[PDB]
């Protein structure tokens, strides 16, 4: 979509969402690893098994 149904959806847990969103913003000055996992909800996020 174009609203929030592209990052804010199956996102039941934010401890993983926010982080991969804030960390992603902090990882510019501090953290150095690459982890883009917020706007994605592949069968590894939306689906917990």
Structure tokens at 24: 């992603």
CA–CA dist 33, 21 (Å, integer): 13
Which residue shows structure tokens 């939306």? 46
**Which residues in 15-43 are b (16+ Cβ under 10 Å) and which e?**
eebeebbebbeeeeeeeeeeeebbeebee
Signed CA dihedral, 1, 6, 9, 4: sign only: negative
Count of residues in the chain = 49
Structure tokens at 22: 């804030």
């Amino acid at each position: 979509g174009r609203r929030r149904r592209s990052v804010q959806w199956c996102a039941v847990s934010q401890p993983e969402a926010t982080k991969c969103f804030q960390w992603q913003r902090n990882m510019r000055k501090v953290r150095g690893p690459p982890v883009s996992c917020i706007k994605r909800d592949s069968p590894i996020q939306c689906i917990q098994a």
